Amino acid sequence: TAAAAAEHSQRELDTVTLEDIKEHVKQLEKAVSGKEPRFVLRALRMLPSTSRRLNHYVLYKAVQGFFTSNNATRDFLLPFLEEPMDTEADLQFRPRTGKAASTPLLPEVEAYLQLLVVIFMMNSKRYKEAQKISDDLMQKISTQNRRALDLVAAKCYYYHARVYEFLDKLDVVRSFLHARLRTATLRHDADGQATLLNLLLRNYLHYSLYDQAEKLVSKSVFPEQANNNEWARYLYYTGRIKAIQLEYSEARRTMTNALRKAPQHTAVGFKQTVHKLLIVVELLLGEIPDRLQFRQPSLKRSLMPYFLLTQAVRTGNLAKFNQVLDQFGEKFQADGTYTLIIRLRHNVIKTGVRMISLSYSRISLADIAQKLQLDSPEDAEFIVAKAIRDGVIEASINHEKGYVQSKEMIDIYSTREPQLAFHQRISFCLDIHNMSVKAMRFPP
Amino acid sequence: IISTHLAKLYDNLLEQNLIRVIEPFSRVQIEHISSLIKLSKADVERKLSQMILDKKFHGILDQGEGVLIIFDEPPVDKTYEAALETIQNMSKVVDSLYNKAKKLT
Amino acid sequence: YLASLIRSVVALHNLINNKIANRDAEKKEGQ
Amino acid sequence: DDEFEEFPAHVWEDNWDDDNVEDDFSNQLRAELEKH
Amino acid sequence: GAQWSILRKDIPSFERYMAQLKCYYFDYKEQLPESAYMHQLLGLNLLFLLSQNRVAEFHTELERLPAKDIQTNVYIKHPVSLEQYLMEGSYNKVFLAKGNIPAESYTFFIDILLDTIRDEIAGCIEKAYEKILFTEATRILFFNTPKKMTDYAKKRGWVLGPNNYYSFASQTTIPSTELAKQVIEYARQLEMIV
Amino acid sequence: LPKNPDLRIAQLRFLLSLPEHRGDAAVRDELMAAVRDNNMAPYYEALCKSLDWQIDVDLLNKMKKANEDELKRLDEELEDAEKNLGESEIRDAMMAKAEYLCRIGDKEGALTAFRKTYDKTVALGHRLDIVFYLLRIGLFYMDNDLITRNTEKAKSLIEEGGDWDRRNRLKVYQGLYCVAIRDFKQAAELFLDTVSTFTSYELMDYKTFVTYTVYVSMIALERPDLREKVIKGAEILEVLHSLPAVRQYLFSLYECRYSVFFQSLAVVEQEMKKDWLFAPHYRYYVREMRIHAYSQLLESYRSLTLGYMAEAFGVGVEFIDQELSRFIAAGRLHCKIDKVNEIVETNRPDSKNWQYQETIKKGDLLLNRVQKLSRVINM
């Protein structure tokens, strides 16, 4: 009886998951009772695993008993979740047999449970009842002005946004999201503020409201106490913004920081995106990004075309460069790059002159021109001058006899800047120590 | 071993003569040193090259003006060296802490 | 700067130890 | 703790040394000596 | 109204009317049909932005454009190619490409682009090309007669060096108090019971 | 130890595979003679399939008939020992059949046979010898997975206990692996360690072995250690007396006699390309040697004329200019060029500057880790 064996395995997994959910709701209730929110973040920490297992109808199993004191949820949840339980199921699991006091479920608690249901139907692909139910949850959260509810609110906002994105509409999300963001700024929330900022930024980006989003970010202050995930998203967004806006140095540093702060274990899609953007910005600025990324296991498949591109540019042959663009434009646009591809159409010569400068001190203008195939050896003068404008290289030029003098590098150590960097890091370390000694916890 | 012991004498004595003649100098003419030691310019500069490679005297040749810039090699900052080693060591330590935390969390 | 690194790392170690010990203790009182 | 669902998807370390050049030396030294 | 602003050379009217033009074109894409006289004016705005040197907003509106229209159209294409030339630095080619104007509407914005080019080369020669003489300056900076460049000496005239070299690219104090503050702060942080 | 297999067979195979060497009639003759004599039935079949050789029919038929007769008698002897003899000799019988599977070229069959023999066996020496056979096959067929796992098993056995003879044999195996995988540092270390007690003669001729030791050492040794080990190496000089070329290479480098160093490097490059083991490293090695030559030349100068570079290396000027520019771009040199006035300057950073740079980098990395962990925990 393969069907019976599968049913038994599924049922035991269902019992385990129900116990886990009971533990999580215990975390929530004890958090609110003890006045500490972070336990909510803990309980949410393993949400991805709960979603993965997806508790297909263990949702129904749990809710049927969970939702009695506030059964007003039943009218909604039960019809949407059907009643597929096998007629024989001798568990009747529910908190204190559901109710020893029949008190209402705590806002955080039922919000989280309804959110789990939202996730279930999310992966179930039914985004009409799902979007309506998400909107209902949004009404709940908007009504419920409880601090600890902040984190659950942020997650609810994330997931509503995701479903509306799949519906490919947004817009109403833009407006409502914006209202919520202003609300969560008026009330000094940090994680929600950052999360909502990220969502709204991505919404602008999808429709390509780049310049408006630029004003938004510039005029909005990101929170420091935001989760690695949120910082990674926000940094990626700001990086794409500035890269399109022709601030390549900021693009590089910001996206590199984003990749550093991103988790290494997973999020391969995010890693691929960040790597693509960093690759392109660095290539524009001249630096040929290391081969470590290309040889990374979870990236080479996603980056063949970028490797072909870097090969073409390093060769400095527009023939293979442009034919590579021909072959792989579709994915290039799919990510959104052609603007940056033309920026490269430009910066090929910039990188050539950059390396030329790096490998000379007093080379002749005509020599560099013929080295770069740049006919009419005055176009070369203009090009190097523009390079100086940009700051890609540091070298004066003397047209009197036509030669570029590379600036004599100075002993930076014989300055104050090492002191400045070390002061910054000293403050960094002292702050880390102080916050840790704050984070000390002591039992009574 | 006059076949080659004479050669080792030649080499070590030439080294001694060069170190002696150059100690009382700073950046100085290679040709002038060659006249001082009465030996071919190419050979003297070459021997100086090997001496420098082996870190015998803190000096650097220059085939431009054709001179030899001597200097005083300052002590390497063992403070920085120990700092670098300690940084690697705490890399290991914090890695251990990280693994422990993930195991217990 | 290096000495500050020393201080920070040791403090962080202390935090990890205290956190895990307290979690295990509260788990015990749970059971 | 998070996955960013929004974003979907020779054993050694070498640089761009590939550089599609011919024999590193044989041809180079042969031609150089011929000229020289 | 936009073409009227162009005819009157009234940049404020031009920009405002083209702002409404964007708000109309890019807002209600499906509810509206293609505006036959839209890409021409939008490429003319490309030229406008390039001439004002507002490159950031220029690229923003580029990306907001549909991808294929970047290349398929001539009105859109021509400003883009000119911009690529300017970014590269082939200002000689830029000047040579004056004639290739898809629409006569691209008029006087070319001239704003020209004097913007002049200002760009001015900054170029300022912070680089040390001590350039008058003749080289005139031949490179495609100004008018040497009298007109003597007038252009209105543009701060550098100093003209000894021989009209236009000068050049113009080019301690222990921060004791501030460093003392920093170290005092280090000690403070090390010292509090916290 | 026995040629199970004879890796010169793989060398000949790679040679034949090489484009201009596909027409190596003499190598063809040697390889097919060896195939016939050692009964390389499956190995020859794979060989002719890979290189499109006309599949031998009649000679191969008699060859496979002999192979089948041998297999039948071997398996029958195995059965006899199993039914009547004890474990001690049954193990020898299965080991012998696995060895014959090697002597034919039954790769997976030999793998399984040696696996079972090791599983049953109890002698540590026998276990290590079987692992040696496995490793030899694995190197013969570049199955790096196989080599690494067999090395793992061999080491584990050794920490359990071992004899220095097989320690040396394992070190030689590991050095050959490091060479195959471009790990010249550990390769040279192990090669110079084992030169004292080279014993795995089966792997390769001693002369070629010391040739490889010299190459890897030059690559991965600083000038001092090179002095005390290769130039002053007792046998690393006695055998060099016999060697008429690598001697010149090494010394040309050491006493810095140049353009003879480059002629030697070009020669050894051709031979390195011909060799099967080093073939997927000859480009990289040649580049590295050229870089080392340039670095040694420059280390004793501050501003040295490009022209004099040209004469000293016995080459042109434009060629040297191109190479210097390329490697400068690579950033492996602390040197900058002047072309208007042909000269090269050395921008060697202060010890203080360089160490401060390293401190900045390492501090950034470790602080990143620290904030990461502090964050993961405090939240």
Swiss-Prot record, chain B:
It is found in: Nucleus; Cytoplasm, Cytosol. Induction: By FOXO4; expression in embryonic stem cells (ESCs) is mediated by FOXO4. Phosphorylated by AMPK. Signal peptide: none annotated. It comes from the Eukaryota. Highly expressed in embryonic stem cells (ESCs). Expression decreases as ESCs differentiate. Component of the 26S proteasome, a multiprotein complex involved in the ATP-dependent degradation of ubiquitinated proteins. This complex plays a key role in the maintenance of protein homeostasis by removing misfolded or damaged proteins, which could impair cellular functions, and by removing proteins whose functions are no longer required. Therefore, the proteasome participates in numerous cellular processes, including cell cycle progression, apoptosis, or DNA damage repair. In the complex, PSMD11 is required for proteasome assembly. Belongs to the proteasome subunit S9 family. Component of the 19S proteasome regulatory particle complex. The 26S proteasome consists of a 20S core particle (CP) and two 19S regulatory subunits (RP). The regulatory particle is made of a lid composed of 9 subunits including PSMD11, a base containing 6 ATPases and few additional components. This is 26S proteasome non-ATPase regulatory subunit 11. It comes from Homo sapiens (Human). The lineage of its organism: Eukaryota, Metazoa, Chordata, Craniata, Vertebrata. The chain holds residues 318 to 422 of 422 of the full protein.
Curated annotation (Swiss-Prot), chain C:
Transmembrane segments: none annotated. It comes from the Eukaryota. Does not bind a metal ion. Component of the 19S proteasome regulatory particle complex. The 26S proteasome consists of a 20S core particle (CP) and two 19S regulatory subunits (RP). The regulatory particle is made of a lid composed of 9 subunits including PSMD7, a base containing 6 ATPases and few additional components. Within the complex, PSMD7 interacts with subunit PSMD4 through their respective MPN domain. Interacts with TRIM5. Belongs to the peptidase M67A family. Component of the 26S proteasome, a multiprotein complex involved in the ATP-dependent degradation of ubiquitinated proteins. This complex plays a key role in the maintenance of protein homeostasis by removing misfolded or damaged proteins, which could impair cellular functions, and by removing proteins whose functions are no longer required. Therefore, the proteasome participates in numerous cellular processes, including cell cycle progression, apoptosis, or DNA damage repair. This is 26S proteasome non-ATPase regulatory subunit 7. The chain holds residues 261 to 291 of 324 of the full protein.
UniProtKB/Swiss-Prot annotation, chain E:
GO terms for biological process: proteasome-mediated ubiquitin-dependent protein catabolic process. The keyword Lipid metabolism does not apply. GO terms for cellular component: cytosol; nucleoplasm; nucleus; proteasome accessory complex; proteasome complex; proteasome regulatory particle; proteasome regulatory particle, lid subcomplex. It comes from the Eukaryota. There is a cross-link at K147 (Glycyl lysine isopeptide (Lys-Gly) (interchain with G-Cter in SUMO2)). Residues 12-175 form the PCI domain. Coiled coil: none annotated. Keywords: Isopeptide bond, Phosphoprotein, Proteasome, Ubl conjugation. The keyword Ubl conjugation applies. Belongs to the proteasome subunit S14 family. Component of the 19S proteasome regulatory particle complex. The 26S proteasome consists of a 20S core particle (CP) and two 19S regulatory subunits (RP). The regulatory particle is made of a lid composed of 9 subunits including PSMD8, a base containing 6 ATPases and few additional components. Interacts with DDI2. Interacts with TASOR. Component of the 26S proteasome, a multiprotein complex involved in the ATP-dependent degradation of ubiquitinated proteins. This complex plays a key role in the maintenance of protein homeostasis by removing misfolded or damaged proteins, which could impair cellular functions, and by removing proteins whose functions are no longer required. Therefore, the proteasome participates in numerous cellular processes, including cell cycle progression, apoptosis, or DNA damage repair. This is 26S proteasome non-ATPase regulatory subunit 8. It comes from Homo sapiens (Human).
Curated annotation (Swiss-Prot), chain F:
One of its GO terms (biological process) is proteasome-mediated ubiquitin-dependent protein catabolic process. GO terms for cellular component: cytosol; extracellular region; ficolin-1-rich granule lumen; nucleoplasm; proteasome accessory complex; proteasome complex; proteasome regulatory particle; secretory granule lumen. It comes from the Eukaryota. Disulfide bonds: none annotated. Transmembrane segments: none annotated. SUPFAM superfamilies: TPR-like, Winged helix' DNA-binding domain. Residues 183-351 form the PCI domain. The keyword Transport does not apply. Keywords: Proteasome. InterPro entries: PCI_dom (IPR000717), Rpn7/CSN1 (IPR019585), Rpn7_N (IPR045135), RPN7_PSMD6_C (IPR049549), TPR-like_helical_dom_sf (IPR011990), WH_DNA-bd_sf (IPR036390). SMART domains: PINT. Belongs to the proteasome subunit S10 family. Component of the 19S proteasome regulatory particle complex. The 26S proteasome consists of a 20S core particle (CP) and two 19S regulatory subunits (RP). The regulatory particle is made of a lid composed of 9 subunits including PSMD6, a base containing 6 ATPases and few additional components. This is 26S proteasome non-ATPase regulatory subunit 6.
